[PDB]
């Protein structure tokens, strides 16, 4: 039968529903966009930018090779770019 | 006579809110030049 929640097909054809979500939905889209367009996403997650996979005349992977020095190894690899 | 905020309400937005946010992010990605 039914459990007493409001039906979906009622909600999404209601006026109030589309008054809220015409703002909330594009705003989230725009927020997500900016997360990328500002470059914040690169920094938060540590993802190399297209210019920062290798040093210029370098073609070895900055591959972590120690378990406990792992953090510092990534960071040393990064200074080899700046 | 229908609650607005329910458990169901939270399940949906737990899923729907970051979906759209990720969707905007992936959209911007199509415009990245190397």
């Amino acid at each position: 039968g039914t459990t007493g929640e409001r039906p979906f097909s009622d909600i999404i054809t209601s006026v109030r529903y589309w008054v809220i979500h015409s703002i909330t939905i594009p705003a989230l889209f725009i927020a997500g966009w900016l997360f990328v367009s500002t470059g914040l996403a690169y920094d938060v997650f540590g993802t190399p930018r297209p210019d920062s996979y290798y040093a210029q005349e370098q073609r070895s992977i900055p591959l972590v090779t120690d378990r406990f020095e792992a953090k510092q190894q990534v960071e040393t690899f990064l200074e080899q770019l700046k | 006579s229908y609650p607005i905020f329910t458990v169901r309400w939270v399940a949906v937005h737990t899923l729907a809110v970051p979906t759209i946010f990720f969707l905007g992010a992936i959209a911007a990605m199509q415009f990245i030049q190397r």
């Binding site: 109030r16 008054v19 809220i20 703002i23 909330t24 705003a27 989230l28 725009i30 927020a31 900016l34 997360f35 500002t38 470059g39 914040l40 | 607005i4 905020f5 946010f21």
Partner: peptide, 28 residues
Amino acid sequence: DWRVLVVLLPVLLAAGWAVRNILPYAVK
């Protein structure tokens, strides 16, 4: 840094806008 407020602002206005629009029916 600054890009964090930039990103967060659409979602604060978004949750702002929905709160205003729904606040009467939520008190019931």
